[PDB]
Structure formats: structure tokens, C-alpha cells
Design a protein around this nucleic acid. Structure first.
Ligand SMILES: [K+]
Ligand SMILES: [K+]
Ligand SMILES: [Mg+2]
Ligand SMILES: [Mg+2]
Ligand SMILES: [Zn+2]
Ligand SMILES: [Zn+2]
Lengths: 468, 468
DNA sequence: AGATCTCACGGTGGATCGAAAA
DNA sequence: TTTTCGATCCACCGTGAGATCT
DNA sequence: AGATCTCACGGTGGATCGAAAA
DNA sequence: TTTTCGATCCACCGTGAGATCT
């Protein structure tokens, strides 16, 4: 009847951030100018919001938290995709797989001191290996569906109590049905920030190799994501600790350092290298940490690899080995798609330049796995790079959470307030609703080490400053 | 061509508080839905704003202040009124008078610590005594044009330096011409808050009477407003000081108190009445003030008249005299239109109940003028009651100033910022532009003393809590 | 003058209500 | 009937001008 | 853990620019 | 010509996530 559909009227409601009274006025005014069939009455817009929700049985809201049954959320996402974003029925026998990434991050909105929200982004819906639907900007907030948020300051224990809880549900989800087709989900925990990567890093030690025990005949199990994490989660820490273990057994060339009078001069050179490094960058070193052993944070480990040349010249290690390690890792966490065949040979060349040069130190299982087997993961799981929502993108999500809470929630009760915030986080991330944003300006294209560009494929849309 | 005029598109721009990017998106979206002739392109909306401004020669903006030549502002207001709000040419010989109130108030927005803005509201445009245009809500912000604002914390000296400056311009303004008619302005300084009324109260003493020297043959000059102020500005103070002078010469019944041993017991009873009043209300009394003599603020004088009964029973004065004074003043500052014939006789009855009862105290020129001649002013000048913008209305003006400064001003430069704020304060107060607001809820109708209702005519639209 | 206590109100979107259409 | 749609209601609460106070 | 320094970016509406129509 | 109209530019700056620090 009218011109605006109730589904695109909603897109106008959200792109303009209009409030209920503002939209009712926007309708009534342009009704009084005579033009009658322009916008739907807010009753219809509500009805149209009602289609974007999961059924009320699976969304539970409390004064502190709001969570959606992951199964129902995925069912809803698939339902929307098939409803509108396809020319349907062109695939009636083919097998249907929806590949999706997920994660979580805590924000500090300056009680509602901080929010710990789990998010899920469907990346790709594939029919029998062939692409039906893609996510046009997989590093932007336009499809970041919520799973749960809670007003609990992010701690280490809550992250574990959330990962185990979400994984015990990922294992249980059976495929979701829609208009006769049966779609199966493939979830990858990829939207992991830095400090959460540190918190979950508790895989401290393993056998010589679960796979290698050289042949690869020991197969791979991919569910629950544990491998990708333990292998390449960001990794950045467990290579730097081993490089430091080399940097202290350097004068003596022995891995089992219980030999004659070594440990004391090990600690003495440990003190000297640490003095010179605290001199040149004013950054602390691995020396002592209370939990899980002596370690460092990634916010220092990045500067460890920022100038591989200088740290290697000061620590007494080869420049080019640290350069190539800073290249292989800066290709993992670059956020750009990884050219797997090239990366396999670069990792091989690095493993060689390492072991043909360093034999007195034997390869720990973490450095064994990043180089010898790390390249296989990006191919076998075809993962989006370890990147998660952009700097600007995560800022947009957090700013819009604050906005939905302050200006667009009903103050009748606390539960109604989180209900509004959640059922707006769902609308504003629907795969149906066209919902515009202010045009982004071009950034300087992020520079990486020269050997990384040959490693990546730089046709993508992503504009981070600190972390992609 | 299109449906929305560039003049009503602006009304939609302001009623919805849309930003330039929001309006451009609102146009483009509903253009992509096919409907082409709905809104004007923002170029046209700018062109339509250009008509609401005074010519650029008379608006001067500085990093601190922004002021409009009052003459040009009134010319613009008359131009708008005649352009659109009339069925024109029905009055080609009649004489045209535009009656307008004005004032100023400082606000403290929590450097831009406070703003001191002068405002002007056209109330009534009259043709040869007959009404052509009225202000539908003369106590609401919908027509409050700005004259000047400045980021200077409101002090006593700036208010005087502004009143003299504005009055030296009101005296100089010649009538404004539009479409062949010649309209003459009649300005009344009525939008005066409480503390500004105190600041301007510096008319301390005069002769026995400028008019009465009983016959009224000494005529009235009405320009520059000085009379209305000195007579009834709010008045509230100069009657209470005289009532206190009575309350201390009470035991002795002598006005010239240089008599035998009186002054000391005058001060002693002064101390006793002050003790009992500081006991019952915990409010200080006139006793000592540094400037212009011993005085009080109106925020205490209102509680002086709040319960006339108790203060009179404690101070030793007649209940009914203070009751009738609290009635005559609460009819002056009630904010409702004053039924002049009834008020004349009530003032006469009060003057009688005062002087037939109190002769030993002679009438000071302020109490002489409020009662004997005060009733004539409201008739001769036909003033709106001393009320100024409502509590909710002034809150709306200050909140919208804050909004225009924060969200709807360009940050390119400080002068551009005040330019935006001012040329939005002008648009949002134009007599042409239909600009809607959220519907106000009904308040409890303000209660006054029983004798005031017979004094006023309560058909009006005004909803103050503290001060109309 | 400058600081704090008070406290009535603008604003939030769904839930209900009641006509009125389909 | 069953939907559509405007007018209120829900309850809180951030805010900002008045009031009181040092 | 909790606090502060840093610092690149979203957002503001008119001023200019350049085609493109009237 | 003279207007219309979209795409940038103007310069700041409040804000909010990272980084550094106790
Ligand atoms: K108020
Ligand atoms: K940022
Ligand atoms: Mg994080
Ligand atoms: Mg004031
Ligand atoms: Zn292995
Ligand atoms: Zn007189």
C-alpha cells in the first residue's frame, strides 16, 4: 500500500537514530502535508521489529545480564538470511553450511561500570562448497549479533566461566532448519582481544607433540576451537619466552642447564640483558610473574617484536631470526587473509634458519607448532585471520551500546532497560535491515614488515590503527 | 514542485532536531524508495534559513559575545509577521503598532560557565487599536527572539551596563517599514527575573511624590520603562522594609523617632522580633546590608508574605493588612492578566485599611505608589503581567541553547560556533516557521490567596511552579 | 560569591485501552 | 471476528534551576 | 588492579568547488 | 548567464580505547 516497507522504515528509524516520538512526529508532519502513503504507522514498525527477535522463550534478561540461547540466535540468523538475502529455491539438494566467527570483549563505559558482551558474526553461508551469501565487511559491526551481555567488570575468572559455558553449548547445537533446507553451523572463536588471549593462554605445557609425537598421521579434531588457540591464538607470548630462554643459555650452548656451574651465569647474563633492555625501551622483562610462571603481557611483547633488529643486537641473538619471527607473527595477527601456500614455505624457511642455526636449544612444543604445523590450520579451517572487530568498529559497537542504553531505552524498570538494549542490538545487526552509517574516511594503509606483504593478500576493507 | 516547502522542511528540521547529515540521509533514503518530490535538497533548506536572518551588517559575533542590532531584529520580526501570518492588504490606512516585551536572564550551563542573554518577544501587532496578530503563548519560548548573548558570568554591574546600553537604543529606534506599511514599536521591559529585579532596584529614594507632590494632574512619561520598574517591578522589597519600620516603632507610635529615649527600645524590640522570626522560619531579617542600605533578598521576602498570618501575629502587626498586601502583590506577580477595575478598588480598600489604622507611620513613596497609583499602570500600559518565560519555558530555552552549542554548532572556529548558536536561536523563534514540541502535561493549577482569584482573569496558558 | 540539598519534571519504548476499520 | 492505530500509562531518574547554606 | 597520559578520530554546518541543469 | 546540488574542506575537540605507570 504505502511506499516504505515496514522493514525499510525500520532501516530509516535506525540509520537516523530516531526516537519513538521523533518517528511519530516524522510521520504525522509529512501526513499533514498531504502525502499519505510515505511512512508506516509506528504500530507497523513495532510489528516489523517483532520479526527480528528470537522467540521470547530463549532470551532471558536480568537486572544485571541478558542472554540469548545461542541455538535460537543462530536459527534466527539463518532464517533472516534465507528469507530475504537470496533468490531462493536455486539450491534444493545441495548441502548447506553457515560458517560463523564469534568472541567476546569487555568495555568500560565511563553499577554499569563495564559490560562483558559475547558476540557472533556470520561470515559465510555456503552451499555444497559453493558460496551463497557472504559478509561484505566481516570486520565491521554491521552483522555483529549479540549472544549475552552483563554488567560485570571483566575479570579472568568470568572469561573462563563464559568460554566453558558457551562451548558446552556449541557442542550441543544441532543444525537449524528453514523453509525445508537444513543448515549446519561451523563456529570459530576468533573475536578475541589481546588480554583475553592472555587470560585463556592456560595451555602451559604439553607432550613432545600431540600430532608429531616426520609424519602428520595423528589427525586433527576441530570442534571447541582449543587447537587454533593453543597454536596461534595471537603465539606472541610463548615464542618470546623461548627466545628469552635461548638468550640466557647463549654463552654455554646447552638446553639441559643442570651442567657444571651454568645456572648462576645464566642468571647473571639474564640480569645484564634485562638491564640493557630496561635501558633502551624502559620495558620490563619476563623475570617474575605470580601465576602460571614467569611471563609478560602482549602489550610489551609487541614492542619486543616492533624493532626485531635492535632487540636482537642487544640480547645477543640473530637479527634475521627475530625478523622472520616478527614477520610470521605479524602475518598471523595482521587481520588480512593469509596466502597459505606462501606462508607454508616461509614457515619452513624460518624453522630451518632456526634449527640449522640453533641446535643446542631444542624446539619447545609451542615454537614447534607455530612453524611446523601452524600453517596447516589456516588452510584446514579456512579461518578469517585472527583479527576481530576493527578499532573503529569496536568503538562503534561500544558507543552504540552506550547510546541505546542512555537515549533509546525505557526507564520504566531495569529489566525493560536491558530488554531495550538487547532487542536493539539485535535489530541493528540484522542481515535483512538496510541500516546506513556516516561515510568513513580513508586511513593510511597499515604498514607491515616487507616480507609480510608477500605473505598476505591485501584486497580487503579494514582500517585499524592498533589491532585489526 | 515538491511537497514540502523549504519553509516547512525547516520546521521538520527543527522539530526533529535533525543534523545536516541526518537530514541529507533522510532525503536521500526516501529518494531511493522512488518518491522524488518529498523533501527539498539541503541547499534549499539553507536558502530558506537565509531568509530568517537579519542582514549581515547588524549581527556582530565575537569569541565571547553575539549581538544583533535591535533595530534590525525588530525590522526582521515585523517583516516575517507581515509576510506570512496575515491575509494582507486588509489594512492600508490604519495605524500599526507592534507591542513587544523584552528582558534578559543569565543561565549557568554545567570559559562557558554562564551565559547572559537578552531576549525579546513580540506580543501583539495592532492596527489602529484593533488586533491583527497575537502571540498565542506569550509565556512560552516559541517566539523568544535573541538580542544578545555573552559568555560572561552574570554580575550586578554587567546588568546595568546592559540595561543602559539597550535603553539608549530603544530610545533611538524609528518605526520599521514593510510592504508599504509603517509599523511603530512599543517595548516593555518585562522579562525580568527576581535577582535582576533586585539588582536594578536602585531607585532608593525620591521626593514626596513625583506625581502626587489629591489630583493626578502630573502626567506620565512611559518610555524607557523606569516607572513600571520603580512602581511594581516585583514592589516586593520596599513594602516589606516599610512594614518592618512599622514593626519597630510599634510600642511608641511615632514616625520621626528622634523623640525621648525611643531609638534604643526600637532596636531592642527589633532584636526580639528578629529572634522570634529566626526561631519560626530560620530566615534572616533586614538587619544589615552593605550596599544601598539595610535590605533583604526577594527569596526571603516571598516567605515573608507566604503565611501573612503568622508573621503578623509574631511581629505585632495586623493580620489582615499583611494578608491584603500579600494579596495585592501576589496578584501583581501572579503572571495572570489583571482585572484592572477590580484591582483599583482592592488597592483603595488596602490603602484605607492601612492609613485609617496606621497614621503614626506616614506612607513612604514606594507604598504610596504601589497602592494609590500602582493600579493605573496596568491599565495605561496594558502590560502583560510582570511574568516572564515560565519555569518550564526558561528551562526549555536554556536546554536548547546547550543543545545548539554542543550538537548543532560547527567546531571549525569559535566565531562560527556562536554564529551557529545565534542563527539557530533566530530560526527556532521565527514567527513563520511551524516548529513543534513534545506535548506538555497538565500541572496542578497554581493556588493563590482567595482574594487574588477575584483579582485576576484565569483564562490563559501558563504552568509555572515557582514563578510565572 | 560559591557550594550543596531538594525535588518536580522531560524523556524512554512497550503494554493496555478503546475505537475504528478489514 | 481480527488487525490497525492513536492516546495514555508505566515507573524510574538524570538533570537543572531554586533554595538553603557557609 | 586501578589510575592517568596520549592521541588519532567521529562529528559539526557553512564555504568553496565543480558539474549540471534552467 | 544564474540557480541547483552533491562531494569535499574547514579546524577544532570531546571522547574513548591503548599505553605507560604505580
Ligand atoms: K525544573
Ligand atoms: K579511538
Ligand atoms: Mg578487550
Ligand atoms: Mg535569572
Ligand atoms: Zn607437531
Ligand atoms: Zn503619588
Amino acid at each position: 500500500s504505502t511506499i516504505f516497507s515496514p522493514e525499510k522504515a525500520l532501516g530509516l528509524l535506525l540509520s537516523l537514530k530516531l526516537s519513538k516520538w521523533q518517528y511519530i512526529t516524522l510521520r504525522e508532519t509529512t501526513i499533514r502535508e498531504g502525502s499519505k502513503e510515505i511512512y508506516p504507522s509506528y504500530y507497523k514498525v513495532q510489528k516489523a521489529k517483532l520479526q527480528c527477535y528470537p522467540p521470547k522463550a530463549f532470551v532471558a534478561v536480568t537486572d544485571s545480564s541478558a542472554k540469548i540461547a545461542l541455538q535460537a540466535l543462530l536459527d534466527l540468523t539463518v532464517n533472516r538470511i534465507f528469507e530475504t538475502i537470496r533468490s531462493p529455491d536455486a539450491i534444493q539438494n545441495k548441502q548447506l553450511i553457515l560458517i560463523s566467527k564469534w568472541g567476546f570483549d569487555g568495555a568500560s563505559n565511563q553499577g554499569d561500570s563495564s559490560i562483558f558482551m559475547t558476540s557472533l558474526v556470520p561470515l559465510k553461508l555456503t552451499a555444497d562448497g559453493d558460496t551463497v551469501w557472504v559478509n561484505p565487511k566481516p570486520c565491521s559491526p554491521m552483522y555483529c549479533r549479540p549472544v549475552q551481555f552483563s554488567f560485570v567488570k571483566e575479570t579472568k575468572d568470568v572469561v573462563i566461566n563464559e568460554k566453558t559455558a558457551m562451548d558446552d553449548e556449541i557442542e550441543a547445537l544441532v543444525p537449524s532448519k528453514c523453509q525445508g533446507h537444513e543448515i549446519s553451523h561451523k563456529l570459530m572463536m576468533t573475536m578475541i582481544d589481546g588480554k583475553i588471549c592472555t587470560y585463556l593462554s592456560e595451555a602451559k605445557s604439553n607432550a613432545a607433540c600431540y600430532l608429531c609425537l616426520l609424519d602428520v598421521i595423528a589427525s586433527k579434531t576441530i570442534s571447541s576451537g582449543v587447537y587454533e588457540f593453543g597454536l596461534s591464538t595471537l603465539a606472541r607470548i610463548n615464542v618470546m619466552e623461548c627466545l628469552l630462554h635461548i638468550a640466557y643459555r647463549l654463552d654455554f650452548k646447552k638446553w639441559s642447564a643442570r651442567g657444571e656451574g651454568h645456572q648462576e651465569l645464566l642468571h647473571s647474563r639474564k640480569k645484564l640483558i634485562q638491564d640493557r633492555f630496561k635501558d633502551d625501551l624502559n620495558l620490563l622483562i619476563d623475570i617474575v610473574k605470580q601465576g602460571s610462571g614467569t611471563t609478560n603481557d602482549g602489550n610489551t611483547a609487541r614492542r619486543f617484536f616492533e624493532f626485531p633488529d635492535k632487540t636482537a643486537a642487544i640480547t645477543g641473538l640473530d637479527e634475521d631470526l627475530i625478523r622472520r619471527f616478527s614477520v610470521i607473527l605479524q602475518a598471523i595477527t595482521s587481520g588480512e587473509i593469509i596466502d597459505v601456500p606462501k606462508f607454508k614455505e616461509y614457515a619452513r624457511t624460518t624453522a630451518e634458519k632456526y634449527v640449522e642455526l640453533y641446535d643446542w636449544y631444542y624446539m619447545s612444543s609451542t615454537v614447534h607448532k607455530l612453524l611446523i604445523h601452524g600453517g596447516d590450520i589456516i588452510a584446514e579451517n579456512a579461518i578469517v585471520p585472527i583479527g576481530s572487530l576493527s578499532e573503529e568498529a569496536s568503538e562503534a559497537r561500544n558507543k552504540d551500546f552506550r547510546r541505546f542504553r542512555e537515549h533509546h531505552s525505557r526507564k520504566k524498570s531495569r529489566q525493560a532497560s536491558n530488554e531495550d538494549i538487547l532487542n536493539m542490538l539485535i535489530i541493528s545487526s540484522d542481515p535483512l535491515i538496510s541500516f546506513t552509517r556516516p561515510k568513513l574516511d580513508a586511513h593510511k594503509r597499515q604498514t607491515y614488515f616487507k616480507e609480510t606483504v608477500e605473505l598476505l593478500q591485501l584486497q580487503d576493507q579494514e582500517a585499524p590503527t592498533e589491532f585489526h
